[PDB]
């Protein structure tokens, strides 16, 4: 089976809870990796949580966070959805301090970037075998999604950035077939900033919603077909999606400069001119999480919206979030099902531990009754070490 | 292969021990979840233990049992029958503080209820994919079996309650096909109370024996066909099945008010006008367990019975119990095999630990020689934390 | 595939080492069961180590050996050959304080005896489903092999004993087909004593070599065809096989009374009128282990032998031992391959720990070069708890 | 599918990182074996890490490294590539203090040598079943590759040494078919010394690059066809491959006596008259690692080379290294892909711990962009025990 990727997004009314791993609570006693970016991706058969670890466990001296983010120890691993990430249940994928993965219907593509800041190399694997490499073209921290790539009709697609995180950088779309790059194009995007894209397939094309770390408190997007013919923009809604951000107000279809520097990995789903935005509840802190349906929010700049569904209370820590889909080949549906995961970050810099880790929760979009609540991490910090 | 569910219960004389997990004894040293309701359910290929955890391990601070029962941390997980429930051998099923699961011959149906007391939502999954949701209709702790649902001819069936635990509530039978609710009916059951139903298939229909928490010390039952044409009653035997309960005496085919408030999840199997009742040995405490064959106990009110088989001594803790079956498709028999599990609850409120957990034992009904004994939990409490 | 069991034992010259699990050394730090009787049995596909645990781990208070041997906590579990027996790698088989298991080519038969001393019940499972039970007929500790049953032509065979361990008891051969007892016969064996038989298939029949705990320092044997037509005797060699035993001398084809009380589970392989005897090196202590080829030792009473191969030095602890075979269906050979395992018992009563456990080693018979050595347990006792 | 082994080495420009297990960092907290020689080998389906353990865990008293290398506790085990080697994820292979393994397309061949120094026996297994033994022919530490054997056209091939480690010894090539030795030949190699060969298939033949422990600071090699018609030599490059070694200078096509005694397991790949040499960065210590492309280094004695790629910085420990390949049957390529692993040795003698263990990294040769870096072990020593 190659996933066709030709279906359109399912009609939905809200979000039903799909998983919660309690990784940090369990890690208080069990042997659980210190992790970041616990992104989900699915095949035609099953779903997995991918993550990066510093190859260190919770409640151990090696969890000391002072280790640079981009270390030679960092690896991309995966485990079944909803399980604490342990060396006893986790598959090794790639050596990586920035990553993506996705399944095309026939096998897993994983992308893992390691190496020095001035010459990082992305190693691409398909079915665990090295199939290609991509080296840094601007010599300044080649980096990728930290969530699932998108697959349509036997090709898979991702976005990579190279250059400053605080100014203009360079952004490329890659088309990958059985783990080999067969096409790429650089975005002609002056004044845009793309990091940490959340990309999903929809109607034979791909939509990516990303993080502007330079000068945007709304989210940039890029969409493209199988030929890499692309469009770019920012989400117009005055319901601002980044963190930090200003209070909701008048949006812009370009980068909103107020509170624009810095950011958080996030996602959104476009439905016609409307948008489901996932975002933190706080405008200043990585706290809380909510889903907002803004029926004109893709193209219109008002701060009006119609539905809010709570996911994590503002009194609890959240973190990165990303899209994942479930294809008809997996679900038996006639439409592409949208889902998302949230990383619940504990420890530094907000809390007094030597380490920083996340646990995860995830939700799937359904057209049936749902409810808002708070499903926070739940660990009591500090631990012993 | 869909399970037909058209066979009648096997002729049996007694109960042969099937499993014992020693979960709590193992968890004194190993990495074992704090759990409750370790219910067994089987496919055409294998049997699993399902359970709810607060996503915390024995001998750890997060096991602190002051946490609400209905917490956002609670998850339904499963592991192979007879193994200690660990993060290293347990599959994630659903986020849930009340649950059921069963296999239809083709895939697993899991039902996990989470969300707030005033608006809980049951998430249904078939083969791990969300297929439906059911929202609270009385805004008062939507809740379900805590043991296996029953499947017949490609549909599976369960009971949900919404409303007070100490007065009249609302009870519904759900018919589910490949994870989708295709029919439901509310029981017209004034003066009845149904919680925590133990439901099994028998001759193309389903029988549920439940817990009246309001005002009955005998057990309510409901039976129904594939169309949800139902019958209701209480078990007539003066061999009372609930805990607490009075001493054995004259029964009633309606709710026996003496010691009727409160209760424990349990089960019974109807054979003609007779009944096998599983029950605690104590009338006041969750202590001991025994199987009683009362050959007229379904419909007659005397306190006479013909066989008692000891399962757990009165000097040892017991707990929840439930039915599960093994279908002909699994066993190769021409009849439906009755089995049951018993949860052996340790810790709070009876014992001085910060936590409450159960281990489990299980038995299958056989027409060959058996013996009574005591197979208790066996852990030495307290631990270290 | 049903295993035919029609081949004869392979020609061999010695024993090549097959596995060593280091269970107790690993258990010093890891989560490893306290176990006894780590017997191996194989299918047409793979080999497993079966064992009994008290459902307690090494370095834990629950390992306290003062627990009766015949406890309600004891379970039969299995793990892959050569792996430390852990709750994280071990399959649950049966609740049992005495056990057997074997594969017929189509599925696993397990036999697990639990219950009280005066009315123990053997639960038989095939493919993990209960298929039969056998209750104590003398009301005095029904008990079985503690090693693999033997399968020939789709039937499997075992020996059970009921009665005194220090005087005349009752001994039965059972023929089991797909987990159902289809035939049994009681041995007419006055003055014989059979416990803990080690039984293997050979040329369409079964040979069992056992332990006389009453008054024999040589080993009793029983052989039988598929109809349960049997013969009985004792191994004639003056190379005495039990522990304790006298120094080698003149044997007897009946029970050798000198040092005859007490014993140890062991095995031997008959080749024509010759015998491969496995035995401890000490005559008084469960110390050392060696294989001895006595070319006339089955039928003749001299103490002469031709080959000794060391297995464990006399300065190291050994323990129970048993036969297992590998059938042509597994190996591709034209003959039945003999193998054996040895349990290396550590702790009480010989050593100052609260617990008693064994690790294991195993060897297969080959017609190619081999060498004698010592492969002892290797743990340094006591542990922390 | 038998692996043909008829393809020639893939054209490559550099080495892409394939795995990193972080074994020692993880073992600071988790249950991880003390290991040595973590060699990788692959089938037509997957790659595994094989390793020797003393059957003891990190942070435990049994890790005490005063134990002989050649102990009866040492076992060959395997786990998936990139996972910490634990008792919970590792398969048992053989009892062994020296080993090799490889897959022929149909099953795994494992070779494990145990027994005393004066009479060691190699036990060969195919699909886990004993298929042959080879006994010491010089009664002086029979020993083998400590990395994968090489398979071509249904036969697999290895090298064994018997005799002094500090003088002339005896060297044999073995040809093995389905686990059975079908041919062997002794090398007529006066004044050569072969230990710890790294052997790979290439164009229907096999090339082994080895360690001269007697009197060579360059590496000896032997190549042979399927008939065991062989050639011998030393790598001519003045870029010396052993450790210890002199500074680069004039090489020799025979053994380079300067700093020739002692050595380290290593590998090299021949391309035409050129060579990729993997080596430590230090000439005196097992520190650093680098890959050097010397385009005439197989046959010419100059110290010129054209490419250096850094793998581990000189300020970090390295250790043993070996070749492994990925066959077309696995990769879908039309050429034989070269890979290598490096063992990163921590503990004794260089560091103050009771133990010595290695973690691992591995790389595959690619014709696409790569980068040099340092991917060292990363553990902070000592631990607690
Ligand atoms: C998590 O990682 C952190 C970074 O690695 C650790 O913090 C560091 O701790 C070290 C202690 O090893 C400390 O080192 C220096 O501290 C002083 C500088 O302000 C200085 O006085 C010290 O110099 C003395 O000691 C060293 C021996 O290491 C000798 O070489 C010197 O001659 C002298 O005697 C020393 O250089 C760092 O300051 C500190 N890093 C920073 C910048 O925060 C944490 O310890 C670790 N956390 C845990 C819990 O392990
Ligand atoms: C492994 O299991 C063994 C058996 O269970 C334990 O040994 C037992 O330890 C207990 C202590 O609980 C001991 O109990 C009695 O000891 C005295 C009899 O000689 C007697 O003075 C004691 O009576 C006092 O204490 C009890 C409280 O438990 C009160 O009820 C009394 O009123 C009085 O104050 C007590 O009854 C046993 O003697 C002993 N068993 C034997 C026969 O060896 C081990 O402790 C255990 N090992 C470990 C390390 O845990
Ligand atoms: C358990 O939790 C409750 C409420 O949070 C608290 O009062 C109590 O101190 C806790 N117990 C322990 C031992 O931490
Ligand atoms: C390690 O073993 C040696 C020899 O048995 C001994 O001399 C030493 O004390 C041991 N080290 C430790 C820390 O136990
Ligand atoms: Ca921003
Ligand atoms: Ca709007
Ligand atoms: Ca532990
Ligand atoms: Ca009640
Ligand atoms: Ca009655
Ligand atoms: Ca005896
Ligand atoms: Ca003799
Ligand atoms: Ca050398
Ligand atoms: Ca050169």
CSV table of N, CA and C in Angstrom, one decimal, chain B residues 33-93:
chain,number,residue,atom,x,y,z
B,33,UNK,N,3.1,-0.9,37.9
B,33,UNK,CA,2.0,0.1,38.1
B,33,UNK,C,1.2,-0.2,39.3
B,34,UNK,N,0.8,0.9,40.0
B,34,UNK,CA,-0.4,0.9,40.9
B,34,UNK,C,-1.6,0.8,40.0
B,35,UNK,N,-2.4,-0.2,40.2
B,35,UNK,CA,-3.6,-0.5,39.3
B,35,UNK,C,-4.9,-0.7,40.1
B,36,UNK,N,-6.0,-0.7,39.4
B,36,UNK,CA,-7.3,-1.2,39.9
B,36,UNK,C,-8.0,-1.8,38.7
B,37,UNK,N,-9.0,-2.7,39.1
B,37,UNK,CA,-9.8,-3.4,38.1
B,37,UNK,C,-9.1,-4.1,37.0
B,38,UNK,N,-8.3,-5.1,37.4
B,38,UNK,CA,-7.5,-5.9,36.4
B,38,UNK,C,-8.4,-7.0,35.7
B,39,UNK,N,-9.3,-6.5,34.8
B,39,UNK,CA,-10.2,-7.4,34.2
B,39,UNK,C,-9.7,-8.1,33.0
B,40,UNK,N,-10.1,-9.4,32.8
B,40,UNK,CA,-9.5,-10.2,31.7
B,40,UNK,C,-10.5,-10.2,30.6
B,41,UNK,N,-10.0,-10.2,29.4
B,41,UNK,CA,-10.8,-10.4,28.2
B,41,UNK,C,-10.0,-11.1,27.1
B,42,UNK,N,-10.7,-11.8,26.2
B,42,UNK,CA,-10.0,-12.7,25.3
B,42,UNK,C,-10.5,-12.5,23.8
B,43,UNK,N,-9.6,-12.8,22.9
B,43,UNK,CA,-10.0,-12.8,21.5
B,43,UNK,C,-10.1,-14.2,21.1
B,44,UNK,N,-10.1,-14.5,19.8
B,44,UNK,CA,-10.1,-15.8,19.3
B,44,UNK,C,-8.7,-16.4,19.3
B,45,UNK,N,-7.7,-15.6,19.9
B,45,UNK,CA,-6.3,-16.0,19.9
B,45,UNK,C,-5.6,-16.0,21.2
B,46,UNK,N,-6.0,-15.2,22.1
B,46,UNK,CA,-5.3,-14.9,23.4
B,46,UNK,C,-6.1,-14.1,24.4
B,47,UNK,N,-5.7,-14.1,25.6
B,47,UNK,CA,-6.4,-13.4,26.6
B,47,UNK,C,-5.5,-12.3,27.2
B,48,UNK,N,-6.0,-11.2,27.5
B,48,UNK,CA,-5.3,-10.1,28.1
B,48,UNK,C,-5.9,-9.6,29.4
B,49,UNK,N,-5.0,-9.1,30.3
B,49,UNK,CA,-5.5,-8.4,31.4
B,49,UNK,C,-5.5,-6.8,31.1
B,50,UNK,N,-6.7,-6.3,31.2
B,50,UNK,CA,-6.9,-4.8,31.1
B,50,UNK,C,-6.9,-4.3,32.5
B,51,UNK,N,-6.5,-3.0,32.7
B,51,UNK,CA,-6.4,-2.4,34.0
B,51,UNK,C,-6.4,-0.9,33.9
B,52,UNK,N,-6.8,-0.2,35.0
B,52,UNK,CA,-6.6,1.3,35.1
B,52,UNK,C,-5.4,1.6,36.0
B,53,UNK,N,-4.6,2.5,35.5
B,53,UNK,CA,-3.5,3.0,36.3
B,53,UNK,C,-3.6,4.5,36.4
B,54,UNK,N,-3.1,5.1,37.5
B,54,UNK,CA,-3.0,6.5,37.7
B,54,UNK,C,-1.6,7.0,37.1
B,55,UNK,N,-1.0,6.1,36.3
B,55,UNK,CA,0.2,6.4,35.7
B,55,UNK,C,1.3,6.7,36.7
B,56,UNK,N,1.4,5.8,37.7
B,56,UNK,CA,2.4,5.8,38.8
B,56,UNK,C,2.8,4.4,39.2
B,57,UNK,N,3.9,4.2,39.8
B,57,UNK,CA,4.5,2.9,40.1
B,57,UNK,C,4.4,2.6,41.6
B,58,UNK,N,4.4,1.3,42.0
B,58,UNK,CA,4.5,1.0,43.4
B,58,UNK,C,5.8,1.4,43.9
B,59,UNK,N,5.9,1.7,45.2
B,59,UNK,CA,7.2,2.2,45.9
B,59,UNK,C,7.6,3.5,45.3
B,60,UNK,N,6.7,4.4,45.0
B,60,UNK,CA,7.0,5.8,44.5
B,60,UNK,C,6.0,6.8,45.0
B,61,UNK,N,6.5,8.1,45.1
B,61,UNK,CA,5.6,9.1,45.7
B,61,UNK,C,4.3,9.4,44.9
B,62,UNK,N,4.3,9.1,43.6
B,62,UNK,CA,3.2,9.4,42.8
B,62,UNK,C,2.0,8.4,43.0
B,63,UNK,N,2.3,7.4,43.7
B,63,UNK,CA,1.3,6.4,44.1
B,63,UNK,C,0.4,6.9,45.2
B,64,UNK,N,0.7,8.0,45.8
B,64,UNK,CA,-0.1,8.7,46.8
B,64,UNK,C,-1.6,8.6,46.4
B,65,UNK,N,-2.4,7.9,47.1
B,65,UNK,CA,-3.8,7.6,46.8
B,65,UNK,C,-4.8,8.6,47.1
B,66,UNK,N,-4.3,9.8,47.5
B,66,UNK,CA,-5.2,10.9,47.8
B,66,UNK,C,-5.7,11.6,46.5
B,67,UNK,N,-5.0,11.3,45.4
B,67,UNK,CA,-5.5,11.6,44.1
B,67,UNK,C,-6.9,11.1,43.9
B,68,UNK,N,-7.7,11.9,43.2
B,68,UNK,CA,-9.1,11.5,42.9
B,68,UNK,C,-9.1,10.3,42.1
B,69,UNK,N,-10.1,9.4,42.2
B,69,UNK,CA,-10.3,8.3,41.4
B,69,UNK,C,-10.4,8.8,39.9
B,70,UNK,N,-11.2,9.8,39.7
B,70,UNK,CA,-11.4,10.4,38.4
B,70,UNK,C,-10.4,11.5,38.1
B,71,UNK,N,-9.2,11.0,37.8
B,71,UNK,CA,-8.1,12.0,37.5
B,71,UNK,C,-7.8,12.0,36.0
B,72,UNK,N,-7.2,13.1,35.5
B,72,UNK,CA,-6.7,13.1,34.1
B,72,UNK,C,-5.5,12.2,33.8
B,73,UNK,N,-4.9,11.6,34.9
B,73,UNK,CA,-3.8,10.7,34.7
B,73,UNK,C,-4.2,9.3,34.5
B,74,UNK,N,-5.4,9.0,34.8
B,74,UNK,CA,-5.8,7.6,34.7
B,74,UNK,C,-5.9,7.1,33.3
B,75,UNK,N,-5.3,5.9,33.1
B,75,UNK,CA,-5.3,5.3,31.7
B,75,UNK,C,-5.7,3.9,31.8
B,76,UNK,N,-6.3,3.4,30.7
B,76,UNK,CA,-6.6,2.0,30.5
B,76,UNK,C,-5.4,1.4,29.8
B,77,UNK,N,-4.8,0.4,30.3
B,77,UNK,CA,-3.7,-0.3,29.7
B,77,UNK,C,-4.0,-1.8,29.7
B,78,UNK,N,-3.2,-2.6,29.0
B,78,UNK,CA,-3.3,-4.0,29.1
B,78,UNK,C,-2.0,-4.7,29.0
B,79,UNK,N,-2.0,-5.9,29.6
B,79,UNK,CA,-0.8,-6.8,29.5
B,79,UNK,C,-1.2,-8.2,29.4
B,80,UNK,N,-0.2,-9.1,29.1
B,80,UNK,CA,-0.6,-10.5,29.0
B,80,UNK,C,-1.1,-11.1,30.3
B,81,UNK,N,-2.0,-12.1,30.3
B,81,UNK,CA,-2.5,-12.6,31.5
B,81,UNK,C,-1.4,-13.3,32.4
B,82,UNK,N,-1.4,-12.9,33.7
B,82,UNK,CA,-0.5,-13.6,34.6
B,82,UNK,C,0.8,-12.9,34.8
B,83,UNK,N,1.0,-11.8,34.1
B,83,UNK,CA,2.3,-11.0,34.2
B,83,UNK,C,2.0,-9.8,35.1
B,84,UNK,N,3.0,-9.4,36.0
B,84,UNK,CA,2.9,-8.1,36.7
B,84,UNK,C,2.7,-7.0,35.7
B,85,UNK,N,1.8,-6.0,36.0
B,85,UNK,CA,1.6,-4.9,35.1
B,85,UNK,C,2.7,-3.9,35.2
B,86,UNK,N,3.6,-3.9,34.2
B,86,UNK,CA,4.7,-2.9,34.2
B,86,UNK,C,4.7,-2.0,33.0
B,87,UNK,N,5.4,-0.8,33.2
B,87,UNK,CA,5.5,0.0,31.9
B,87,UNK,C,6.3,-0.7,30.8
B,88,UNK,N,7.0,-1.8,31.1
B,88,UNK,CA,7.8,-2.5,30.1
B,88,UNK,C,7.1,-3.7,29.4
B,89,UNK,N,5.9,-4.1,30.0
B,89,UNK,CA,5.1,-5.1,29.3
B,89,UNK,C,3.7,-4.8,29.0
B,90,UNK,N,3.3,-3.5,29.2
B,90,UNK,CA,1.9,-3.1,29.1
B,90,UNK,C,1.7,-2.2,27.9
B,91,UNK,N,0.6,-2.4,27.2
B,91,UNK,CA,0.2,-1.7,26.0
B,91,UNK,C,-0.7,-0.6,26.5
B,92,UNK,N,-0.6,0.6,25.9
B,92,UNK,CA,-1.6,1.7,26.2
B,92,UNK,C,-2.9,1.5,25.4
B,93,UNK,N,-4.0,1.7,26.0
B,93,UNK,CA,-5.3,1.5,25.3
B,93,UNK,C,-6.1,2.9,25.2
